[PDB]
Enzyme design. Structure first.
Site, mmCIF file in Angstrom:
data_model
loop_
_atom_site.group_PDB
_atom_site.id
_atom_site.type_symbol
_atom_site.label_atom_id
_atom_site.label_comp_id
_atom_site.label_asym_id
_atom_site.label_seq_id
_atom_site.Cartn_x
_atom_site.Cartn_y
_atom_site.Cartn_z
ATOM 1 N N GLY A 143 56.471 70.443 26.792
ATOM 2 C CA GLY A 143 57.256 69.242 26.811
ATOM 3 C C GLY A 143 57.652 68.837 28.200
ATOM 4 N N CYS A 144 58.949 68.966 28.477
ATOM 5 C CA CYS A 144 59.535 68.435 29.678
ATOM 6 C C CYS A 144 59.013 69.101 30.939
ATOM 7 C CB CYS A 144 61.069 68.450 29.588
ATOM 8 S SG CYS A 144 61.502 67.834 27.949
ATOM 9 N N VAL A 145 58.498 70.330 30.817
ATOM 10 C CA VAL A 145 57.977 71.032 31.991
ATOM 11 C C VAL A 145 56.692 70.374 32.399
ATOM 12 C CG1 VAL A 145 56.850 73.145 32.885
ATOM 13 C CG2 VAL A 145 59.058 73.274 31.471
ATOM 14 N N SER A 148 57.200 66.982 33.805
ATOM 15 C CA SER A 148 57.845 67.033 35.086
ATOM 16 C C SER A 148 56.904 67.549 36.172
ATOM 17 C CB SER A 148 59.100 67.930 35.019
ATOM 18 O OG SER A 148 60.127 67.384 34.212
#
Lengths: 199, 200, 200, 198
Positions: A143-145, A148
């Site tokens: 997800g966010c990793v 990012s």
């Protein structure tokens, strides 16, 4: 094949270094909210990197998913994953885990999307400081990793993904996403290699 | 893998008009396996033609992505340290040109990029916004690369992503499937082109 | 000399187009108080805006408010806050940084926090507006030659038709106020008084 | 009021340095299309700055306004200023003026809006290079220069506005906008001062 087309070429490390810790928050550490899998071991291993970062005088950012208390910024992401909307500013679920509590000078980036770069000031925060290589820890790997790390790379920073500081709900996604990152986007290695290779 | 369901991932994303279509990086380089092609990209290209033709006949906003780097490598980036072949994709290199099967016609935006997402360092968000687009259909290559980057950003940018699962391509099937999973769970409505065209 | 503007075709009309939205930029206690960051025609601008906000609420218009906010420990201290050091004192709970009671937000109206001049830079404003399908955005706030203008040029750039409420933007100094309205009228926005805007 | 409220504080200059020349393109050099006022003089002075930067090794970037041949990316900006449309990729009006022709290694940034940063890779390109202070030249002071300056600051860079290397079609807008920038957004100084201090 990736080898045949020239993918996964090494990405040399280069100072100044910074750390981004993505979304290591209570809700993501609890397997009953948004946690599970190897997320908690990843938190623990990040403790070592964070203390190294502080000692080394590196720039450190933490991200948090935070939506407005009226759900006024409730978005497409919060339709796909309804629970994201419950990550309110003052809700315990959205607070950084106590093991990784921010010290003075560390930038707390609040987001309502997966990337800590999207609709935030992170790129500008790191560019002000001349950061060249951004070490990344957090949750989730898929997800966010991941999101990012693609943005860090696209924003002109060299991402060093700490493969044992990124955690996921499910190991298949975790592995599948590390692979992509190693092939297209990042240097990926264990924290102790990162710490050694960065002084 | 049961935590996705317990935790409430994979909720349905209701399709909402106006519709638009984004075709990511179907360029000759990504259609040719000596360069960046292989896997199921070629088939994704073919099926995408139906979606393109429906887009035109329905008056949908159509946008196309191209990877392009400067002729002197002046914009050589981190992306092309990691995948140095990207740098060969120059404006007038055949390899960077949209596949003829899917050539743009008038009114269709072509977005030149040097990163994976069609949204990053480009006018796409602004282009869609001005047109009032609510739901963005996505086709392109590669599923585990620029398609996923563009989908996470499309969503982030306030658009409802609809991944055409038989119109996105990858050079490897495991990555293709793993990134479909993630998108269906977190970022998009995911369905075949015929479900998608019937339902719009 | 300014005849060049009409010759080169500046200042063409920006037709208005629904759905409408309203951005009120930085009408916060520290910009209202003439002893801190206010003065000029800002007090007058704040009050006139009340009629717009109420009318926005009667019409069901998306509504967004902006506030400058830095971190308590100056963590996000930046280039802007070197040029103007007092912005660095605009902290989340500093009354200076709060929206003026005259324009207090309501349920569903978005409060965007920023550490730069534009309500769009490094914030989610563009995507908040996109999601809501907003075509034209009315702008109010302070300062006209600062955050207002930065925000208007961004809005334009992001794909929205800006409508600058000339009697709802204020500055601490009137020469800058008039120059930046001129610029904006010539290049970036439809510019009219609020009675005019609300009538269409 | 600016004095009593803390505006106009000095912005110290910090290496590495970069230079951005904004929209010094034939259309803007031409008083019949978008030129006029003090723009021709900004271009010539900029020659001095570009030569220096090349010699000193700095990162140099040039922006251009470019819309699609079929108007596909015709936008709000192009509604207020419909002539901006006419700047197609291969229209001579969009080309960088010859006196300031790019060399190898210098980034040409294409934009369809005021700012050189907006919807472009300019921030990432400068970030990757670790540029700290960005010298800025171009046209128009009260248009794309200012829009780029405000973005440069917002993006983390220290802007250094080169007051004799930025032009506009009218001296009022040019002076008002230089005033705003000095007060809020940048170090403002003449090329003589910038070059000796950097």
């Amino acid at each position: 094949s990736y080898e045949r087309q020239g993918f996964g070429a090494a990405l040399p490390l280069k100072a100044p270094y910074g750390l981004l810790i993505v979304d290591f928050v209570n809700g993501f550490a609890d397997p009953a909210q948004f946690g599970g899998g190897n997320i908690a071991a990843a938190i623990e291993t990040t403790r070592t990197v964070l203390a190294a970062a502080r000692e080394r005088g590196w720039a450190v950012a933490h991200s948090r998913i935070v939506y407005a208390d009226d759900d006024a910024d409730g978005n497409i992401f919060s339709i796909k994953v309804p629970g994201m909307l419950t990550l309110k500013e003052h809700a315990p679920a959205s607070a950084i885990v106590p093991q990784l509590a921010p010290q003075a000078g560390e930038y707390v980036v609040r987001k309502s999307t997966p990337s800590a770069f999207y609709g935030t000031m992170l790129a500008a925060w790191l560019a002000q400081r001349g950061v060249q290589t951004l070490l990344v820890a957090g949750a989730t790997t898929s997800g966010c990793v991941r999101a990012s790390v693609v943005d860090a790379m696209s924003a002109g920073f060299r991402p060093l993904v700490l493969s044992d500081c990124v955690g996921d709900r499910a190991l298949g996604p975790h592995e599948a996403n590390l692979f992509d990152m190693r092939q297209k986007y990042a240097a990926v290695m264990t924290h102790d290699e990162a710490l050694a290779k960065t002084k």
